[PDB]
Design a protein around this nucleic acid. Sequence first.
DNA 1: TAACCGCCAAGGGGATTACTCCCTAGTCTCCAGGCACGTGTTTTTTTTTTTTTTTTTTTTTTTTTTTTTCCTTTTTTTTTTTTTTTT
Length: 48
Amino acid sequence: ATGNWGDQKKAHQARAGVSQVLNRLTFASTLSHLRRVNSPIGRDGKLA
DNA sequence: TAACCGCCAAGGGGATTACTCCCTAGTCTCCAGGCACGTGTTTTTTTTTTTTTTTTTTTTTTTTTTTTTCCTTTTTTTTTTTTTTTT
């Protein structure tokens, strides 16, 4: 439910965004959300 | 087989006596290197300030806007009331 993939007390060391709310806007949006792949690199890197 | 002994022969040079001479022993007298004393200028040691690289710390990561979801403790020890058993 929360999305933190680990212990509740030690959720700061756990990854966030593994579990997401399913996008029920269209059928195609649901199919795109069911076939999504996420990179573990954070969204602040200057390396391209 | 020639060491050794006996016998004989020959000669060479150290010992002896005398004359000489010359070099050193001895004694003054002047003076100068040999030596006692003081010290040095290089040599080592110690500080002193810098240098140079390594390591650690710290701070940073464009802005604005709109929706959900989950959570906003929890086990663990101590206390306190209740219930049951016994004389």
